[PDB]
Coordinates of C-alpha atoms and ligand atoms in Angstrom, one line a residue:
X1 CA -83.2 131.3 95.0
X2 CA -83.8 134.3 92.6
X3 CA -83.9 133.7 88.8
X4 CA -83.8 136.7 86.4
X5 CA -84.0 139.1 89.4
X6 CA -87.2 137.4 90.6
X7 CA -89.1 137.5 87.3
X8 CA -88.7 133.8 86.3
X9 CA -89.7 130.5 88.0
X10 CA -88.1 127.0 88.1
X11 CA -89.1 126.2 84.5
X12 CA -87.6 129.5 83.3
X13 CA -91.2 130.8 82.7
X14 CA -91.9 134.4 83.3
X15 CA -94.0 134.8 86.5
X16 CA -97.2 136.4 85.2
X17 CA -99.1 138.9 87.3
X18 CA -102.5 140.3 86.4
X19 CA -102.5 144.1 86.0
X20 CA -98.8 144.4 85.1
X21 CA -98.1 146.8 82.2
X22 CA -95.2 146.1 79.9
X23 CA -93.4 148.7 77.9
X24 CA -96.1 151.2 78.8
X25 CA -98.3 149.4 76.2
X26 CA -99.6 145.9 77.0
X27 CA -101.9 145.5 80.0
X28 CA -101.6 141.9 81.2
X29 CA -105.0 140.4 82.0
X30 CA -104.5 136.6 82.6
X31 CA -102.8 133.4 81.7
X32 CA -104.7 131.6 78.8
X33 CA -102.2 129.1 77.6
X34 CA -99.2 127.0 78.6
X35 CA -96.7 124.6 76.9
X36 CA -93.1 123.4 76.6
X37 CA -92.2 126.7 74.9
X38 CA -93.5 128.9 77.8
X39 CA -96.8 130.7 78.3
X40 CA -99.5 132.6 76.5
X41 CA -101.2 135.6 78.0
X42 CA -104.2 137.8 77.2
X43 CA -103.3 141.4 77.0
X44 CA -104.8 144.7 75.9
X45 CA -102.6 146.7 73.6
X46 CA -103.2 150.3 74.4
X47 CA -101.7 151.6 71.1
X48 CA -103.8 149.6 68.6
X49 CA -106.6 149.5 71.1
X50 CA -107.4 145.8 71.0
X51 CA -106.9 142.6 72.8
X52 CA -104.0 140.4 71.9
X53 CA -102.5 137.0 72.8
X54 CA -98.9 137.3 73.7
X55 CA -96.8 134.1 73.6
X56 CA -94.1 134.5 76.2
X57 CA -91.2 132.1 75.4
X58 CA -89.1 130.7 78.3
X59 CA -85.8 132.4 79.2
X60 CA -83.4 129.7 77.9
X61 CA -81.3 129.5 74.7
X62 CA -83.1 126.3 73.5
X63 CA -86.6 127.8 73.6
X64 CA -85.4 131.1 72.3
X65 CA -83.8 129.5 69.2
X66 CA -86.9 127.4 68.6
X67 CA -89.2 130.4 68.8
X68 CA -87.0 132.5 66.5
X69 CA -87.6 129.7 63.9
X70 CA -91.4 130.1 64.5
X71 CA -91.0 133.9 64.0
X72 CA -89.2 133.5 60.8
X73 CA -91.9 131.2 59.3
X74 CA -94.7 133.4 60.5
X75 CA -93.2 136.5 59.0
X76 CA -92.6 134.5 55.8
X77 CA -96.3 133.4 55.7
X78 CA -97.8 136.7 56.7
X79 CA -95.7 138.3 53.9
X80 CA -97.4 136.0 51.3
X81 CA -100.9 136.9 52.9
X82 CA -101.4 140.6 53.8
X83 CA -105.2 140.2 53.4
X84 CA -105.3 137.2 55.8
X85 CA -107.5 135.1 53.5
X86 CA -105.6 131.8 54.2
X87 CA -106.4 131.0 57.9
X88 CA -102.9 131.1 59.5
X89 CA -102.8 132.9 62.8
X90 CA -101.4 136.5 62.4
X91 CA -98.1 137.5 64.1
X92 CA -98.3 141.3 64.7
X93 CA -94.9 142.0 66.1
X94 CA -92.4 140.6 68.6
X95 CA -90.1 142.1 71.2
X96 CA -87.8 141.1 74.1
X97 CA -89.1 141.9 77.5
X98 CA -87.1 141.0 80.7
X99 CA -85.1 138.5 78.7
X100 CA -88.2 136.7 77.3
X101 CA -89.0 136.8 73.6
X102 CA -92.7 137.7 73.2
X103 CA -94.7 137.0 70.1
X104 CA -97.8 139.2 69.8
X105 CA -100.7 137.4 68.0
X106 CA -104.2 138.5 67.2
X107 CA -106.5 137.3 70.1
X108 CA -108.6 134.3 69.1
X109 CA -111.5 132.4 70.7
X110 CA -111.9 128.7 71.6
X111 CA -110.1 125.8 70.0
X112 CA -111.7 122.8 68.3
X113 CA -110.8 120.6 71.2
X114 CA -112.9 122.9 73.4
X115 CA -115.8 122.5 71.0
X116 CA -115.6 118.7 71.2
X117 CA -115.6 119.0 75.0
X118 CA -118.6 121.3 74.9
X119 CA -120.5 118.6 72.9
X120 CA -119.4 116.0 75.6
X121 CA -117.3 114.4 72.8
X122 CA -120.3 113.7 70.6
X123 CA -119.2 116.0 67.7
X124 CA -120.6 118.8 65.7
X125 CA -122.7 118.7 62.6
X126 CA -121.7 117.6 59.1
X127 CA -122.4 121.2 58.0
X128 CA -120.0 122.7 60.5
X129 CA -117.4 120.0 59.8
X130 CA -117.6 121.0 56.1
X131 CA -116.8 124.6 56.9
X132 CA -113.8 123.7 59.0
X133 CA -112.7 121.2 56.3
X134 CA -112.9 123.8 53.5
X135 CA -110.9 126.3 55.4
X136 CA -108.3 123.8 56.5
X137 CA -107.9 122.6 52.9
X138 CA -107.3 126.2 51.8
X139 CA -104.8 126.6 54.5
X140 CA -102.9 123.5 53.4
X141 CA -103.0 124.7 49.8
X142 CA -101.5 128.0 51.0
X143 CA -98.8 126.2 52.9
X144 CA -97.9 124.2 49.8
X145 CA -97.1 127.4 48.1
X146 CA -93.7 126.6 46.5
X147 CA -91.7 129.3 48.2
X148 CA -93.3 128.3 51.5
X149 CA -93.5 124.5 51.3
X150 CA -94.2 124.4 55.1
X151 CA -95.3 121.3 57.1
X152 CA -97.2 122.3 60.2
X153 CA -96.3 118.9 61.5
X154 CA -98.6 119.0 64.5
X155 CA -102.2 119.5 63.3
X156 CA -104.8 118.5 65.8
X157 CA -108.0 120.0 67.2
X158 CA -106.4 122.1 69.9
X159 CA -104.2 123.8 67.4
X160 CA -107.2 125.0 65.4
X161 CA -108.9 128.1 66.9
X162 CA -112.1 130.0 66.1
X163 CA -111.7 133.7 65.3
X164 CA -114.9 134.6 67.0
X165 CA -117.1 132.5 69.3
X166 CA -120.3 133.2 67.3
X167 CA -118.7 132.4 63.9
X168 CA -117.2 129.5 62.1
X169 CA -114.0 131.2 60.9
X170 CA -110.8 129.3 62.0
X171 CA -107.1 129.9 62.3
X172 CA -104.2 127.5 62.6
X173 CA -101.8 128.2 65.5
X174 CA -98.5 126.9 66.8
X175 CA -95.8 126.7 64.1
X176 CA -93.2 125.9 66.7
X177 CA -93.0 122.3 65.6
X178 CA -93.1 123.3 61.9
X179 CA -90.3 123.2 59.4
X180 CA -90.0 123.6 55.6
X181 CA -89.6 120.6 53.2
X182 CA -86.0 119.5 53.2
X183 CA -83.8 116.5 53.9
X184 CA -85.1 114.3 56.8
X185 CA -83.6 115.6 60.1
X186 CA -86.4 114.5 62.5
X187 CA -88.3 111.3 62.8
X188 CA -90.5 111.3 66.0
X189 CA -93.0 113.9 64.8
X190 CA -96.7 114.7 64.8
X191 CA -99.0 114.0 67.8
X192 CA -99.7 110.3 68.0
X193 CA -103.4 110.2 67.2
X194 CA -102.7 112.2 64.1
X195 CA -99.3 110.7 63.1
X196 CA -99.1 109.5 59.6
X197 CA -98.3 106.0 58.5
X198 CA -95.1 107.1 56.7
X199 CA -93.9 108.6 60.0
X200 CA -94.8 105.5 62.0
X201 CA -92.9 103.5 59.4
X202 CA -89.8 105.6 59.6
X203 CA -90.2 106.6 56.0
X204 CA -89.5 109.9 54.2
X205 CA -92.2 112.5 54.6
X206 CA -93.5 115.6 52.9
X207 CA -96.6 118.0 53.2
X208 CA -98.9 115.1 52.8
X209 CA -98.5 114.2 56.5
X210 CA -100.5 117.3 57.3
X211 CA -103.4 116.0 55.1
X212 CA -103.4 112.6 57.0
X213 CA -103.7 114.5 60.2
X214 CA -106.6 116.5 58.6
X215 CA -108.5 113.4 57.7
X216 CA -108.2 112.2 61.3
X217 CA -109.3 115.6 62.6
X218 CA -112.3 115.9 60.4
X219 CA -113.8 112.5 61.4
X220 CA -113.2 113.4 65.1
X221 CA -115.0 116.8 64.7
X222 CA -118.1 114.9 63.6
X223 CA -118.0 111.8 65.8
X224 CA -116.6 113.5 68.9
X225 CA -113.9 110.9 69.4
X226 CA -110.4 110.4 67.9
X227 CA -110.5 108.1 64.8
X228 CA -107.3 106.3 66.0
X229 CA -106.6 106.6 69.7
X230 CA -103.4 104.7 70.1
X231 CA -101.9 104.4 73.6
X232 CA -98.5 103.8 71.9
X233 CA -97.2 103.5 68.3
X234 CA -98.0 99.8 68.0
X235 CA -101.6 100.3 69.2
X236 CA -101.8 103.4 66.9
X237 CA -100.8 101.3 63.8
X238 CA -103.2 98.5 64.8
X239 CA -106.1 101.0 65.1
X240 CA -105.3 102.3 61.6
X241 CA -105.1 98.8 60.3
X242 CA -108.6 97.9 61.7
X243 CA -110.1 100.6 59.5
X244 CA -107.9 100.8 56.4
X245 CA -106.4 97.3 56.1
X246 CA -102.8 96.2 55.9
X247 CA -100.6 98.8 54.2
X248 CA -99.6 98.0 50.6
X249 CA -96.6 95.7 50.2
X250 CA -94.6 98.2 48.1
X251 CA -94.7 100.6 51.0
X252 CA -93.8 98.1 53.7
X253 CA -90.9 96.7 51.6
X254 CA -89.3 100.2 51.9
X255 CA -90.2 100.9 55.6
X256 CA -87.4 100.8 58.1
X257 CA -89.8 100.3 61.0
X258 CA -92.0 97.8 59.2
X259 CA -91.1 95.0 61.7
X260 CA -92.2 97.1 64.6
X261 CA -95.8 96.3 63.5
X262 CA -95.8 93.6 60.8
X263 CA -93.9 90.5 59.7
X264 CA -92.8 89.3 56.2
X265 CA -94.1 85.8 55.3
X266 CA -92.0 83.5 53.2
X267 CA -94.1 84.5 50.1
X268 CA -93.3 88.2 50.6
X269 CA -96.7 89.1 52.0
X270 CA -97.1 91.0 55.3
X271 CA -99.3 90.3 58.3
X272 CA -99.7 91.9 61.7
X273 CA -97.6 90.7 64.6
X274 CA -99.8 89.5 67.5
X275 CA -99.2 91.3 70.8
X276 CA -107.8 92.9 71.1
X277 CA -108.3 94.1 67.5
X278 CA -110.9 93.6 64.8
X279 CA -109.4 91.9 61.7
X280 CA -107.8 94.2 59.2
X281 CA -110.2 96.4 57.3
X282 CA -113.3 95.4 59.2
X283 CA -113.9 98.5 61.2
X284 CA -115.2 100.4 58.2
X285 CA -115.4 104.2 58.0
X286 CA -118.9 103.9 56.5
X287 CA -120.0 102.3 59.8
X288 CA -118.0 104.6 62.0
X289 CA -119.7 107.6 60.4
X290 CA -123.1 105.9 60.3
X291 CA -123.6 106.7 56.7
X292 CA -126.9 104.7 56.4
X293 CA -127.8 104.7 60.2
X294 CA -128.3 108.4 60.9
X295 CA -124.8 109.5 61.6
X296 CA -122.6 108.8 64.7
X297 CA -124.6 106.8 67.2
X298 CA -127.8 107.8 65.2
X299 CA -127.7 111.3 66.6
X300 CA -128.2 113.1 63.3
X301 CA -131.2 111.1 62.0
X302 CA -133.6 113.6 60.3
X303 CA -131.2 116.5 60.5
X304 CA -130.9 118.4 57.2
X305 CA -127.7 117.9 55.2
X306 CA -127.3 114.5 56.8
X307 CA -128.7 112.2 54.2
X308 CA -126.9 109.0 52.9
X309 CA -125.7 111.1 49.9
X310 CA -124.2 113.8 52.1
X311 CA -122.4 111.2 54.2
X312 CA -121.0 109.3 51.2
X313 CA -119.3 112.4 49.9
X314 CA -117.8 113.0 53.3
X315 CA -116.7 109.4 53.6
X316 CA -115.1 109.4 50.1
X317 CA -113.2 112.6 50.8
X318 CA -111.8 111.3 54.1
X319 CA -110.6 108.0 52.5
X320 CA -108.7 110.1 50.0
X321 CA -107.1 111.9 52.9
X322 CA -106.3 108.7 54.6
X323 CA -104.6 107.1 51.6
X324 CA -101.7 105.0 52.7
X325 CA -99.5 106.2 49.9
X326 CA -98.3 109.8 50.4
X327 CA -97.8 110.2 46.6
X328 CA -101.4 109.1 45.9
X329 CA -102.9 110.8 48.9
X330 CA -105.2 113.6 47.9
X331 CA -103.6 117.1 47.6
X332 CA -105.2 120.4 48.8
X333 CA -106.1 121.7 45.3
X334 CA -108.1 118.6 44.4
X335 CA -109.6 118.2 47.9
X336 CA -111.2 121.7 47.4
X337 CA -112.8 120.5 44.2
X338 CA -114.4 117.5 45.9
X339 CA -118.3 117.2 45.6
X340 CA -118.4 117.5 49.5
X341 CA -117.8 121.2 48.9
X342 CA -120.6 121.9 46.4
Ligands
LIG401 C1 -107.0 130.9 74.7 C2 -107.9 131.8 74.0 O1 -109.0 132.0 74.4 N1 -107.5 132.5 72.8 C3 -106.3 132.4 72.3 N2 -105.9 133.1 71.2 C4 -104.6 132.8 70.8 C5 -104.0 133.3 69.8 C6 -102.7 133.0 69.5 C7 -102.1 132.0 70.2 CL1 -100.4 131.4 69.9 C8 -102.8 131.4 71.3 C9 -104.0 131.8 71.6 S1 -105.1 131.3 72.7

């Protein structure tokens, strides 16, 4: 019957009530978020006199331990910011309340998935996509800081939030799936639509998997639709191949899961296994983006900053983000120097 003296539910989530007042400080307004970790609530902090977002972790050793790993990375990041110029969500403090670890974040506005939805999945402009792209690239540069070397490991539109609904400043949230660069412990990582080829191929990975995810995200922000909407891993890889061609032989020769997707011919060349799909490399990004045809579905014809020349810069940057080879794939520092950002 009763769990944690009536405070927790079946899933070990704290049962939130509007109007409750924790620690004579936080006035709970409403539930704004939910996930495997627990819940997120909007609350007014009476001491600092501002709204905050409190992430209430479930009352279970597994989720507690995961969330203390998130706390450690956040404090490590926020210790190399202070001025907050690098677009990571800011952890203010944490405390235990009725056996739930609570992380107090600055309160943010809508996420980029909500934006897509608000466009009816037709996308936002190239100008706004540039602004998100610039900030995300600066965030990834920050994460690559040697003493950090953090992989967010689950970048996707819903994990990118606007600071303010009338402005274009963004913050990355949810470092619960994140770890630093080390020996490979985990293999089933990233969200499928944004999952890198190295990961699909069971290969070793580094910070470059975040850059792959970013390429995918940026095209989606402009088209309204995911670049690669795989219903499973095989379909995911096939959708990547349609656009980018068969992965290079030197990669696939080292891939433990090569044969999940491809097959080695007697001459050492690799083709797709049949299971539907356009031939490899024939769903070109140039055409997906509508470089010469007025953008996605022609919806940006005549709009300023949407000329052929503007689109070719965007296209060229994304292809450098979607490089098959993680060692050749563009890095944050050089991405910021791309002509797309002039
Ligand atoms: C949901 C909303 O309108 N604002 C939000 N703001 C935040 C800030 C931190 C975290 Cl982890 C989640 C959220 S959700």
